Every structure is written in structure tokens, then in C-alpha cells.
Amino acid sequence: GEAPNQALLRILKETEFKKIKVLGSAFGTVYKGLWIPEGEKVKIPVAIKELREATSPKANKEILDEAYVMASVDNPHVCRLLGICLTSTVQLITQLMPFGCLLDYVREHKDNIGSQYLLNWCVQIAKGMNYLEDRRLVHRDLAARNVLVKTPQHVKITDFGRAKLVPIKWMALESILHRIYTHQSDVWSYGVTVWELMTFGSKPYDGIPASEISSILEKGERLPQPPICTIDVYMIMVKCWMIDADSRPKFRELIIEFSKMARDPQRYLVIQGDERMHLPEDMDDVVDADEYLI
Amino acid sequence: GEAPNQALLRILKETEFKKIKVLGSAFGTVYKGLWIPEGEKVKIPVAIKELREATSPKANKEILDEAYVMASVDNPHVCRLLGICLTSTVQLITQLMPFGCLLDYVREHKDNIGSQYLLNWCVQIAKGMNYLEDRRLVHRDLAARNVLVKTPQHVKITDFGRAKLVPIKWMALESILHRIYTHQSDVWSYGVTVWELMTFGSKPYDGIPASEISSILEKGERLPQPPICTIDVYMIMVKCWMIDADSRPKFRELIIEFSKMARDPQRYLVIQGDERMHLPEDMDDVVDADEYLI
Numbered sequence: 318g319e320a321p322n323q324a325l326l327r328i329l330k331e332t333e334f335k336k337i338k339v340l341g342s343a344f345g346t347v348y349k350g351l352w353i354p355e356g357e358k359v360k361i362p363v364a365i366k367e368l369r370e371a372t373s374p375k376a377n378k379e380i381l382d383e384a385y386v387m388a389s390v391d392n393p394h395v396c397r398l399l400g401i402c403l404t405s406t407v408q409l410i411t412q413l414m415p416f417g418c419l420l421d422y423v424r425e426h427k428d429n430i431g432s433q434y435l436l437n438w439c440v441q442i443a444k445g446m447n448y449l450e451d452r453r454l455v456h457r458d459l460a461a462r463n464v465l466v467k468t469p470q471h472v473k474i475t476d477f478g479r480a481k482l483v484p485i486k487w488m489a490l491e492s493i494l495h496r497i498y499t500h501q502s503d504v505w506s507y508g509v510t511v512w513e514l515m516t517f518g519s520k521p522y523d524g525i526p527a528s529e530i531s532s533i534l535e536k537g538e539r540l541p542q543p544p545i546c547t548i549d550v551y552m553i554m555v556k557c558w559m560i561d562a563d564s565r566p567k568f569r570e571l572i573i574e575f576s577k578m579a580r581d582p583q584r585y586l587v588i589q590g591d592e593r594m595h596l597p598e599d600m601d602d603v604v605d606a607d608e609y610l611i
Numbered sequence: 612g613e614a615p616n617q618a619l620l621r622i623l624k625e626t627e628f629k630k631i632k633v634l635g636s637a638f639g640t641v642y643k644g645l646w647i648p649e650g651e652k653v654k655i656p657v658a659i660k661e662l663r664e665a666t667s668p669k670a671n672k673e674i675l676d677e678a679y680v681m682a683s684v685d686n687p688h689v690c691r692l693l694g695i696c697l698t699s700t701v702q703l704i705t706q707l708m709p710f711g712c713l714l715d716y717v718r719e720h721k722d723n724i725g726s727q728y729l730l731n732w733c734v735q736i737a738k739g740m741n742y743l744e745d746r747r748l749v750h751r752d753l754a755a756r757n758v759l760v761k762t763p764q765h766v767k768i769t770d771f772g773r774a775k776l777v778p779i780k781w782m783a784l785e786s787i788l789h790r791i792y793t794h795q796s797d798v799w800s801y802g803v804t805v806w807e808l809m810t811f812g813s814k815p816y817d818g819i820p821a822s823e824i825s826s827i828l829e830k831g832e833r834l835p836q837p838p839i840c841t842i843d844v845y846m847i848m849v850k851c852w853m854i855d856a857d858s859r860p861k862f863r864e865l866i867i868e869f870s871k872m873a874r875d876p877q878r879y880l881v882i883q884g885d886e887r888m889h890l891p892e893d894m895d896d897v898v899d900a901d902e903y904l905i
């Protein structure tokens with residue numbers, strides 16, 4: 318029983334936007350497209366998610382839940398909903414994240430990712446998480462697959478539909494054992510997320526079947542130290558994996574730590590060639606969602 | 612082919628009651644009055660509807676249909692028929708709803724209506740609707756104009772003569788396009804009804820001519836978010852407007868949701884001054900219809 322969520326839900330007209338090409342398919346198909354607000358001579362690159370041509374009282378009810386959340390947030394590192402279209406099949410309109418999920422991006426670009434990028438991503442992701450924590454919101458599926466890339470310099474947390482006010486391999490123990498989820502178990506997944514980024518996109522516990530994890534983590538085992546990782550960075554990952562959730566670090570601390578490290582990247586991440594890394598129709602009225610306010 | 616409708620139709624003697632003053636005029640004139648059952652030393656405030664001094668095989672046949680329905684219902688949030696008088700012109704006798712239609716009442720009283728009232732009205736109306744749904748009855752003209760106010764604390768659904776076992780602006784799409792009406796399209800009008808109450812009595816799509824609606828609603832457009840409405844309440848309105856009728860919510864759910872909200876009104880409706888709102892011949896033998904049983 319807290320404050321009134323006065324966020325506005327913008328309903329869009331089927332015509333206000335147009336699909337351009339499929340982006341990926343799950344049980345919803347996402348398209349890349351443009352949106353032209355009522356009468357504004359502005360064009361906005363967006364992503365249009367459309368429940369499969371189906372319409373099951375359950376599928377239709379989930380996408381809406383997701384819409385409720387996305388609309389109730391506003392932070393530079395969290396995907397915000399732009400609006401929805403109530404057509405035969407419901408469509409969610411979000412900002413276009415050109416480079417896709419961070420997971421694929423580190424894989425597709427290992428050879429060009431430097432410590433600065435990596436560390437800034439950790440900072441950015443932690444900021445978004447801290448934001449959700451302020452809004453007393455518990456993302457319950459934080460992973461490299463759910464971080465989208467607007468630009469190599471700017472990522473944003475997404476996919477927090479399943480979020481509250483399965484990926485057992487990213488789950489804290491309390492969650493796995495007693496379906497308990499707090500901002501702190503979010504930290505645990507943050508740890509694994511970070512771990513994916515440092516291993517340039519590896520699979521956590523690849524091999525070990527979901528069934529074993531609970532026991533494993535109970536023994537005292539964890540994900541290994543990624544090669545590029547100084548003991549400083551690894552230490553932090555480990556702390557996020559303490560069995561005792563209150564003994565794990567707080568996102569605002571995680572921000573503070575990774576920022577410190579972000580000021581002298583080569584001291585905390587050792588990457589061969591770090592120093593030489595480098596990362597990337599009338600479009601006159603194009604404006605990125607981030608500049609299309611209220 | 613279901614159960615036998617054993618409701619009793621009470622025929623009243625012209626003399627058993629007396630008109631007091633006109634209440635409003637349509638093609639039937641309604642008077643405010645009193646009814647004194649045969650020999651009972653009880654006086655009942657009532658409303659007497661009398662077909663215009665005319666008597667056309669069609670007009671006379673409609674009022675009777677209405678009587679059939681009203682007599683076949685019994686719920687605290689549905690106007691029940693008290694009896695009818697077979698005089699030169701037929702007269703329907705219903706319980707007096709002192710404060711009139713809810714539509715006028717929110718208009719005439721904006722400045723004194725708080726979230727608690729609003730939300731309880733949504734609950735009450737939904738209860739009456741769920742009742743009709745149980746009696747497999749489809750009100751086919753649910754709107755703020757057809758909800759009467761017994762007291763600011765107690766409203767009742769009415770005007771379901773046109774009901775089955777035009778207001779295009781309150782109509783679901785299936786109704787507008789293929790004259791299809793289910794309890795679910797009732798939900799759609801429920802949505803608009805609610806929407807009128809939150810906009811303190813506004814006209815849905817004011818401006819847009821009846822001709823456009825069908826197409827509009829098809830594009831994906833809807834009624835806007837009323838100012839006092841948190842995204843939670845608005846969300847529900849929207850769900851009632853899904854093109855797919857089975858993906859809209861069920862009155863018993865609508866009851867459940869609005870009740871939850873009714874327990875902490877200020878969290879779902881933001882109204883300036885909500886906290887300081889306030890709403891309202893020998894009459895020794897007066898008894899409200901609701902206490903005059905069987």
C-alpha cells in the first residue's frame with residue numbers, strides 16, 4: 318500500500334506506425350519499424366511486439382501485464398513502453414534497440430570489446446537495477462539475454478514482464494529452493510549477467526543439468542573466474558553469490574564499485590589488445606525515443 | 612430451454628397509489644409518488660411510469676416486455692418492478708430512486724465525489740451486471756444514464772427493457788458490426804460507464820460522429836485516460852475494450868478488482884481534496900421498497 322501509479326498508458330492508432338521487417342520470434346513476434354505520432358512531423362524507430370496471430374486468455378493477459386510495468390518506469394537504463402495498439406491482436410510499442418540483446422552482441426563482437434565497454438555495461442545495468450529497486454520492483458529474470466543495446470555505449474534492462482512488485486542457472490538459491498525473490502536475489506542474477514559479459518557470452522554451468530544446481534550451489538561451488546578478470550572483479554561476482562542474501566552487495570554499491578574500476582579499466586580487466594579496441598528512406602525527421610518526451 | 616420463470620407479476624389497483632409530481636419525460640412520463648399496499652398501513656416511495664396518453668400496439672407492447680424482465684429479477688443492484696396497473700394507459704411501478712440517474716449526479720456533484728464513492732459504484736454496478744449474467748440476461752444498454760441512485764451509497768442498474776436473454780458510443784465492436792451481443796459486450800459498455808464516472812460525467816468521443824466509431828475502434832484507438840485515474844484503473848477500462856470479447860474481463864473479476872482498489876481508494880484514484888469529500892406529509896409509515904418483501 319504505497320503511492321498512486323499515475324503513469325500514462327498511451328494508446329496508439331494502428332496507422333500511426335508501420336512495420337518494416339521482422340526482428341525475431343517465444344510466443345510473440347517482434348518487428349523493426351517506425352512510428353509517426355499523431356501530427357508531429359517526427360519519425361521514431363521502434364520495436365513492435367505482436368502476440369502470435371493467436372489470442373488466448375492467458376497469452377493476451379501476459380503482454381498486458383508487461384505493458385503495465387514498462388509504462389510505470391522511467392530511467393535511462395530501463396526499456397520504457399511507448400504505447401500499445403488495441404487491434405485484433407495487441408501490439409506493444411517500445412524503443413528500437415538496433416544492436417539487439419547484449420548476449421548476442423558480446424558473442425558477435427568479442428574481438429572488439431574492451432574493458433571500458435564491459436565495465437560501463439556493468440555500471441549501466443546496475444543503475445537500471447537500482448532504479449527498479451527504488452520503484453520497489455523485482456525484475457525476476459535478469460540476464461545478458463534481457464539487456465538490450467541502444468548503442469555500444471548505452472544498454473537498457475528489459476524483459477521484466479515476469480517481474481513483480483525457468484532460468485534456474487541465473488537464480489539465487491532462495492528462489493530455486495523456496496520460490497523466494499527479493500531485490501537481493503536480483504543481485505545474484507546480476508552476478509551471473511556480469512559473468513556472461515566477462516566470458517564474452519558463455520553459458521553458465523554449461524553441461525551441468527538444471528537438476529544439479531540446487532545441490533551444487535549448496536556444496537559451495539560457483540561459476541569460475543573469467544580469464545580477463547582480476548581478482549577484484551571476480552571478488553564482486555562471488556559476493557553476489559553468498560547463500561545469505563543480506564550479505565550480498567546492494568546495486569548502489571555495485572554502481573559505486575564498477576564505476577571506480579571504470580576509471581582505470583586496464584587495472585581490473587586484462588584483455589589482449591584492450592588499447593586498440595573499437596565499436597560502432599528519408600530520415601530527416603528521425604528522433605530517437607529518448608528525445609521524444611511526454 | 613432452461614428453468615421455469617416463476618416470478619410473480621403483481622397487478623396493482625389504480626387507487627393503491629397516488630402520483631405526487633412529474634420526474635421526467637422518450638415516450639413515457641415518470642412521476643414521483645406513493646403506494647399503499649392493499650391493507651397494510653405502509654407507504655412506499657415509488658416511481659410511476661405511464662405510456663404517453665397514446666396507446667400504440669408497439670409502445671404498449673414494449674413497456675410490458677420491460678415489466679416481464681424487471682419482475683424476473685431480484686438483486687440489490689438491479690431495479691426491481693413492484694407491480695403494474697392495467698388502467699386505460701398501463702403504469703409500471705418501480706422503487707423510487709430519489710437521486711436520479713448516476714450520470715446527472717456525478718455532473719451535478721463533481722466537487723464532492725471521492726474515490727471511495729466512485730470505486731464502490733464500480734463494484735456495485737459490476738455486481739448487478741454479474742447478477743444479470745447469472746440469470747443469463749444481457750442488458751444491452753449499460754451506461755451511466757441507466758444506473759439509478761437510491762442513495763449516494765447505493766446505485767442500481769436499470770433500463771434493461773431493450774435487454775435480451777442506438778448508443779453506438781457505448782457499444783462493443785461485434786455489436787456495432789454484426790449486431791452481436793453477449794455478456795462480454797456488456798463488459799465493454801461497463802468500461803465506458805466506468806469511464807463516464809471517472810471523467811465526472813463526460814461524453815464518450817464527444818465530437819466524433821457515430822459514423823466514425825466503427826473504423827476508429829478498428830484502428831486501435833480508445834477513450835483517453837481520465838485525469839483522476841491511476842494506470843491501474845485505466846488498465847481495467849482498456850481491457851474491457853479488447854477487440855477479442857473473450858479476452859475482456861468477467862464481471863466477477865471486475866468485482867474482485869474494484870473491491871481490492873476500494874480498500875485503499877486514494878492509491879488508485881487521485882482526486883484533489885478526496886479526503887474532505889462528503890455526500891448526502893406524514894412519513895411515519897414510510898418503508899423503502901427494499902424492506903417491503905414478497
Ligand SMILES: Nc1ncnc2c1ncn2[C@@H]1O[C@H](COP(=O)(O)OP(=O)(O)NP(=O)(O)O)[C@@H](O)[C@H]1O
Binds near residue numbers: 341342414418465476
Ligand atoms: N526493442 C527491441 N529492439 C530490438 N530487438 C528486440 C527488441 N525487443 C526484443 N528484441 C529481440 O527480438 C527477439 C524476440 O524478443 P522477445 O519478443 O522479447 O522474446 P523473448 O525475449 O525471448 N521472450 P519475451 O521477451 O518474454 O517475449 C529477440 O531477439 C529479442 O532480443
Ligand SMILES: Nc1ncnc2c1ncn2[C@@H]1O[C@H](COP(=O)(O)OP(=O)(O)NP(=O)(O)O)[C@@H](O)[C@H]1O
Binds near residue numbers: 637709
Ligand atoms: N425509478 C426512478 N426514480 C427516479 N427517477 C427515475 C426513475 N426511473 C426513471 N427516472 C428518471 O425519469 C426520467 C425518465 O426516465 P425514463 O422513463 O426511463 O426514460 P429513459 O430512461 O430516457 N428511456 P426509457 O427508460 O426506455 O423510458 C429520467 O430522468 C429517468 O432517469
